[PDB]
Design a protein around this nucleic acid. Structure first.
Length: 578
DNA sequence: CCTGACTCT
DNA sequence: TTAGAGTCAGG
């Protein structure tokens, strides 16, 4: 039961200084996607507008871009970017119901207004899926039906703003929404719309050479196997390895024999076909994903790729990156790393600039756990992987063999992922008795870190959630489960979430601080990408000297911890060279 | 459509 | 029996 005006022209009363606004984009990937309808709810009434009408009306465009005209929305970044593709600027967004719901409880997986409304028992709006349908049936409904839906979403947003802000304020998360997530949303919109330029001539040539190489390795595998088979079928592969070649079975999953990389690496001493298969699967992923999959999403006229940074998805406060994912481009092996030669500046005589925090999660552990030894080591900037090696091996720094340090590495992060003796033994391919001693020795050497792990788990049990430095929360209702596996997993989330989530908080603030300094100083440099603990920029070559000063400082000063934050940086002609 | 593989932080 | 993610081919 809800009255509204199905308008055929914009009127002055639609342009009030406070409104709920819906700019509807049905396609999941909102880059260059149709806007199918608009709804406005304000003190004067409820209005639906056809986009052809509204977006061509100079007063409505003026209103959209007037920062003093405040809009309440759901997923304002989607709207903002879709409008950028329509050549229209959206300003004055004061409340984003998507981000408010996300901060209240990321586990709800809220991704439409109806799901947010459910959190406050508000039911006068339908789910998007119920209106548009799914898969090949997905379609925009008849105008009267669309209009009612959009108007109901706007009225829900209108009514839900205060209840959500009130609950955020109670949680000490109001400033997290208003001063961190909402400002970041605008910075992400800019980054997404800018996109990253791709050197398609180079990428296509890499793909042509890769196809030939894959072919060679493929035939070698068939030769070694005595038979052709589909290497990319774990099922067929399992028959070859474990039935035909009779290699030991080290692990099974629900569907059959495991052929995971960890497993195959341990089989290398039995047959040379296993190293070839590992190489083949690496090369094939390069081909399928970073050559072919990437070329599929390049906008041909501009040679740019435009990712979407999902800001309201991860359980810890990280971003994710989709279609394409530009946060998992290869780097570890030179063979894959060369993909980065295809990512280039968007203008002649510009360069790529990349800065990353060094061991931010470990410096966060040090802060939160107030562990003296760990804090001391970072204060002197003693190498952290060598410090741990000296303790779990019980030797002086000058006795830390190359492999001892690398063994201490995986212990160092492994502790922050809740690693068991079994897992550490499987990782380093070492004695499980020794793996247990390594862990034992670590926690006796970093008693503060040990105290934290015990304390944070007890807190999770008492409160039902854990929190980050800037008051992000994660609820862990399974932490008291009687089931060992369920409970143990939740305890590891209790240990890790405050650390990963705090590191996310810090880089988000650094992004907001950096943008502000860039704009103030009128630098042409701008952000392209965030990769969890790294920021990627492009800028004219003349600005490198400045950025070498500005970017590391901003990132290092974003928060003040009990240990220093450290940032490394490099630049060059392609992402590879940075 | 899910599973298991490779990719990153 | 190691935290958080996305995309892919195969089944």
């Amino acid at each position: 039961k809800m009255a509204f005006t199905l308008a055929d022209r914009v009127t002055e009363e639609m342009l009030a200084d406070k409104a709920a606004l819906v700019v509807e984009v049905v396609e999941e990937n909102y880059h260059d996607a149709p806007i199918v309808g608009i709804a406005v709810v304000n003190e004067h009434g409820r209005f639906f507008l056809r986009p052809e009408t509204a977006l061509a009306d100079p007063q409505f465009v003026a209103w959209l871009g007037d920062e003093t005209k405040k809009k309440s929305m759901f997923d304002s970044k989607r709207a903002a970017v879709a409008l950028k593709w329509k050549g229209i600027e959206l300003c004055g967004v004061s409340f984003d119901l998507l981000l408010a719901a996300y901060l209240l409880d990321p586990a709800q997986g809220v991704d439409d207004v109806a799901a947010a409304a459910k959190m406050k028992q508000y039911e006068a709006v339908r789910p998007d899926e119920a209106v548009y349908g799914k898969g090949a049936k997905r379609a925009v409904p008849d105008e009267p039906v669309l209009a009612e839906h959009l108007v109901r979403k706007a009225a829900a947003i209108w009514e839900l703003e205060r209840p959500f802000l009130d609950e955020l304020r109670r949680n000490e998360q109001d400033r997290l929404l208003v001063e961190l997530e909402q400002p970041l949303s605008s910075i992400l919109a800019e980054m997404e719309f800018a996109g990253v330029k791709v050197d398609t001539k180079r990428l296509e040539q890499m793909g042509k050479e890769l196809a030939e190489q894959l072919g060679t390795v493929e035939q070698r595998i068939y030769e070694l196997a005595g038979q052709e088979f589909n290497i990319n079928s774990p099922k067929q592969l399992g028959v070859i390895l474990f039935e035909k070649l009779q290699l030991p079975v080290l692990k099974k999953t629900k569907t059959g024999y495991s052929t995971s990389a960890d497993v195959l690496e341990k089989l290398a001493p039995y047959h040379e076909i296993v190293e070839n298969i590992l190489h083949y699967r690496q090369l094939g992923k390069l081909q399928s994903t970073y050559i072919e999959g990437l070329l599929k999403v390049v906008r041909p006229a501009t040679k740019k790729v435009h990712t979407i940074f999902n800001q309201a998805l991860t359980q810890t406060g990280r971003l994710s990156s989709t279609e394409p994912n530009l946060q998992n481009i290869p780097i570890r092996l030179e063979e894959g790393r060369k993909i980065r030669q295809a990512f280039v500046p968007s203008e002649s005589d510009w360069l790529i600039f990349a800065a990353d925090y060094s061991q931010i999660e470990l410096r966060v552990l040090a802060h939160i756990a107030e562990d003296d030894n760990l804090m001391e080591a970072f204060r002197r900037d003693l190498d952290i992987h060598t410090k741990t090696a000296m303790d779990i091996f019980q030797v002086s720094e000058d006795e830390v063999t190359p492999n001892m340090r690398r063994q201490a590495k995986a212990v160092n992060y492994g502790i922050v992922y809740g690693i068991s003796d079994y897992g550490l033994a499987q990782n380093l391919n070492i004695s499980r008795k020794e793996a247990a001693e390594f862990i034992e020795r670590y926690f006796e050497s970093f008693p503060g870190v040990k105290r934290y792990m015990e304390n944070i788990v007890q807190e999770a049990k008492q409160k039902g959630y854990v929190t980050t430095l800037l008051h992000r929360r994660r609820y862990l209702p399974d932490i008291t489960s009687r089931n060992f596996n369920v409970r143990s997993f939740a305890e590891r989330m209790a240990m890790n979430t405050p650390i990963q989530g705090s590191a996310a908080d810090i880089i988000k603030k650094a992004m907001i601080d950096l943008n502000a300094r860039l704009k103030e100083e009128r630098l042409q440099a701008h952000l392209l990408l965030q990769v969890h603990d790294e920021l990627i920029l492009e800028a004219p070559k003349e600005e490198m000297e400045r950025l070498c000063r500005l970017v590391p400082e901003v990132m290092e000063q974003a928060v003040t911890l009990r240990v220093p934050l450290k940032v490394d940086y490099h630049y060059g002609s392609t992402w590879y060279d940075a």
